[PDB]
Amino acid sequence: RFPADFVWGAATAAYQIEGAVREDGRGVSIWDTFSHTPGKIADGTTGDVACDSYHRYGEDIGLLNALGMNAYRFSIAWPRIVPLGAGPINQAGLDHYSRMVDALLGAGLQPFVTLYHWDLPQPLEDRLGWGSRATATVFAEYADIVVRQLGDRVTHWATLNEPWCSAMLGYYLGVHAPGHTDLKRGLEASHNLLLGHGLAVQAMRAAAPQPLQIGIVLNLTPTYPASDSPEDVAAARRFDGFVNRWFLDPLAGRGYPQDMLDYYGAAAPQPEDLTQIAAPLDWLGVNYYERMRAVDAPDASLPQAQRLDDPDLPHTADREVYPEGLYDILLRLHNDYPFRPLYITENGCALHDEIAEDGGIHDGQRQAFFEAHLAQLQRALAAGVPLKGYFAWSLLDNFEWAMGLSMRYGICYTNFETLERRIKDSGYWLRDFIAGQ
Ligand SMILES: OC[C@H]1CNC[C@@H](O)[C@@H]1O
Ligand code: NA
Structure with missing residues (x-):
């Protein structure tokens, strides 16, 4: 059993589900630009329509209610709120989210709002985006405006989702928007994301009409050397630094990890920033999908660490399944880092889901995925980890970034042609x- 007041939810992000990309004053985001660039998305799709949740969030609410959830993690689209990124507000965007928040509260669903889930306004990108310190400042101003208007009703806020992705997939590996490919630009982005976050936490506390519970959401990948050789152990530490400690340590008031600063060398970004980054949080969100079993790869791009596949583990449509990694990473946070309480702000999986002849979606491996990870959460709780809720990624099938509509993570199936949603077997199990409980 979980605590009686445990938060039980599902999660989405605005660009992945909303559609209506030009409606009601919405600006252009980097993902509008990126998905409309030939060859950036695997299947030729965009977020132009997606799940049409701009218009259909009522149906999404109906799903959450049918699942008996008590919370919904969703993001607010910065392009709807300040269409030019730096500039005037769009009250019609704020009013949309206001109505949605009221609909959620009316249904007994607590909103866990993400300010930034990757949809940077394009005019900011045109001035270097996360490569520019000014982007941090104006992110904080956006955070201020949203909290002034919604913070009477919404207490739980996350500044960023997965700054590692925004920085390293967006500016270093080039697979996510805006599609840059330079390490130094990636690392600069990571700094300005973190600064942005810190400036926003301060802004939000000042703007808020009541005390808030503010967090950040990080993807964390527990990393394990494939052997105990100094080479493989070092590769594990480098990957662990590249994904996890690079963000955890400055958030914790510890500066950037020195081993990583040494390794990155001249690519590393340029005390006062560090203080701001460490603005005290009320909680930390963990997004957990996979481990990294690391071998040294001296000829690879930094961090010169490659995955050693294990064919004996289960695999989904896109990942390796390793539930025990969730316990490991939570125990580490609890014992080694100062963040508390913790929320699992995402966990879930992608499969080749189809509507069967009976009308159901028989996604047994996703059911087994939830059951296995929830069991690891029970262990973590038994160890004293201060865990206060769990959000399944995703409420419904959606626009999965560079994989488009083709990679289905929902607990609910989305027919992208009719926009009909249907609960999958794993959604009924969660229910x-x-x-x-
Ligand atoms: O790839 C699955 C998910 C990982 N976390 C961020 C989400 O936007 C994404 O769909
Ligand atoms: Na498989």
């Missing part, structure tokens, strides 16, 4: 598991 009935949550009810039994």
Whole structure:
């Protein structure tokens, strides 16, 4: 059993589900630009329509209610709120989210709002985006405006989702928007994301009409050397630094990890910033999908660490399944780092889901995925980890970034042609598991 007041939710992000990309004054985001660039998305799709949740968030609410959830993690689209990124507000964007928040509260669903889930306004990108310190400042101003208007009703806020992705996939590996490919630009982006976050936490506390519970959401990948050789151990530490400690340590008031500063060398970004980054948080969100079993790869791009596949583990449509990594990473946070309480702000999986002849979606491996990770959460809780909720990624099938509409993570199936949603078997399992609490 979980605590009686445990938060039980599902998660989405605005660009992945909303559609209506030009409606009601919305500006252009980097993902509008990126998905409309030939060859950036695997299947030729965009977020232009997606799940049409701009218009259909009522149906999404109906799903959450049918699942017996008590919370919904979703993001606010910065391009709807300040269409030019730096500039005037768009009250019609704020009013949309206001109505949505009221609909959620009316349904008994607590909103866990993400300010930034990757949809940087394009005019900011045109001035270097996360490569520019001014972007941090104006992110903080956006955070101020949203909290002034919604913070009477929404207490739980996350500044960023997965700054590692925004910086390293967006500016270093080039697979996410805006599609840059330079290490130094990636690392500069990571700094300005973190500064942005810190400036926003301060801004939000000053703007808020009541005390808030502010967090950040990080993807964390527990890393394990494939052997105990100095080479493989070092590769594990480098990957662990590249993904996890690079963000955890400055958030914790510890500066950037020195081993990584040494390794990155001249690519590393340029005390006062560090203080701001460490603005005290009320909680930390963990997004957990996979481990990294690392071998040294001296000829690879930094961090010169490659995955050693294990064919004996299960795999989904896109990842290796390793539930025990969730326990490991939570125990580490609890014992080694100062953030508390913690929320699992995402966990879930992608499969080749189809509507069967009976009308159901028989996604047994996703059911087994939830059951296995929830069992690891019970262990973590038994160890004293201060965990206060769990959000399944995703409420519904959606626009999965560079993989487009083709990679389905929902607990609900989305027919992208009709926009009809249907609960999958794993969604019914969650329903009935949550009810039994
Ligand atoms: O790839 C699965 C998910 C990982 N976390 C961020 C989400 O936007 C994404 O869909
Ligand atoms: Na498989």
